[PDB]
Design a protein around this ligand. Sequence first.
Ligand SMILES: OC[C@H]1O[C@@H](O)[C@H](O)[C@@H](O)[C@H]1O
Ligand SMILES: OC[C@H]1O[C@H](O)[C@H](O)[C@@H](O)[C@H]1O
Ligand SMILES: OC[C@H]1O[C@H](O)[C@H](O)[C@@H](O)[C@H]1O
Ligand SMILES: OC[C@H]1O[C@H](O)[C@H](O)[C@@H](O)[C@H]1O
Ligand SMILES: OC[C@H]1O[C@H](O)[C@H](O)[C@@H](O)[C@H]1O
Ligand SMILES: OC[C@H]1O[C@H](O)[C@H](O)[C@@H](O)[C@H]1O
Lengths: 149, 149
Amino acid sequence: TTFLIKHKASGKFLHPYGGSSNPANNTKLVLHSDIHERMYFQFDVVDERWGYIKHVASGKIVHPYGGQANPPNETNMVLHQDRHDRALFAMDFFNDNIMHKGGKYIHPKGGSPNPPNNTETVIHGDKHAAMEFIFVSPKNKDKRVLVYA
Amino acid sequence: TTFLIKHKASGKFLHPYGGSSNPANNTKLVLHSDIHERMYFQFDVVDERWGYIKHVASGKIVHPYGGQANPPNETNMVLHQDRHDRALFAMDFFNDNIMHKGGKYIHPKGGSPNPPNNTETVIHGDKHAAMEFIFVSPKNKDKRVLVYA
Ligand SMILES: OC[C@H]1O[C@@H](O)[C@H](O)[C@@H](O)[C@H]1O
Ligand SMILES: OC[C@H]1O[C@H](O)[C@H](O)[C@@H](O)[C@H]1O
Ligand SMILES: OC[C@H]1O[C@H](O)[C@H](O)[C@@H](O)[C@H]1O
Ligand SMILES: OC[C@H]1O[C@H](O)[C@H](O)[C@@H](O)[C@H]1O
Ligand SMILES: OC[C@H]1O[C@H](O)[C@H](O)[C@@H](O)[C@H]1O
Ligand SMILES: OC[C@H]1O[C@H](O)[C@H](O)[C@@H](O)[C@H]1O
């Protein structure tokens, strides 16, 4: 299932910085208000809840920068071609968050409920309203879709 | 995906009372330690998180007895052949519970974390350790499996 990753508090979406159909390895993931095919994602299940968050246009997936199993707070989120267990996430559509295998979450850097366009996303352990995400239809940005199959 | 519904606190499983391969409509759902093909379930997605919890052997699905949209606390869980929106549940594999569309959860009657075989299950709004369930492989009762597809 293809979906948009929507920051719940702001309504902005996860994008590769620059919006390329083929971002280079280690391109940062940011929040931005635009909708287009280069901010579409899919989720590839690896082990029950755990899987890869895949940028549809390029096939690269979401990583903590440097590929840590236990990335520290403020580690940047990036896209990278590699597939390994340090790029595993769970798409928690009940609590509305995205958790890395190490137990921390994807946040907007700085934790704003209304981050401006091109705000970087990072790992952080905190849980609060400004780190919530919902997963929605590319044809209807208010319609939640099931990302697991 | 076929799975066992395992009460987390006790390790007992959801069964039709009596274990029939074709339980009559309104047969109660109980907790019991046995494993066999007549306590296998599947989840049929209807609307994102919402779907029907299907008894594999019979094709009947889980209902609150009486089929109310807002069943009160202590309403018995049963199997019934009917499909309608009052038989919609979400299988919350993040918080480890089963939620009815009306917002309440499946519980062991009376709330014991170590209830005896043939304990009835019921609707109740409370959240606590004794209403947690996990969804596991029929071939390995300790291995969580993804119920959504
Ligand atoms: O019947 C189920 C209920 O049993 C009560 O005794 C318990 O306090 C509730 O939280 C719920 O578990
Ligand atoms: O950084 C993300 C941003 O990149 C470019 O500016 C694109 O034009 C936008 O649509 C958006 O994808
Ligand atoms: O930035 C992410 C990137 O980090 C390191 O370079 C790892 O070796 C890669 O596999 C990838 O995880
Ligand atoms: O960078 C993310 C980080 O931003 C701020 O420091 C917030 O207080 C934290 O809760 C977290 O959201
Ligand atoms: O009530 C459930 C219970 O019913 C019968 O006793 C069966 O023999 C058991 O395996 C179990 O299914
Ligand atoms: O007990 C379950 C049963 O309850 C009532 O009889 C409803 O009308 C049926 O569809 C079914 O939901």
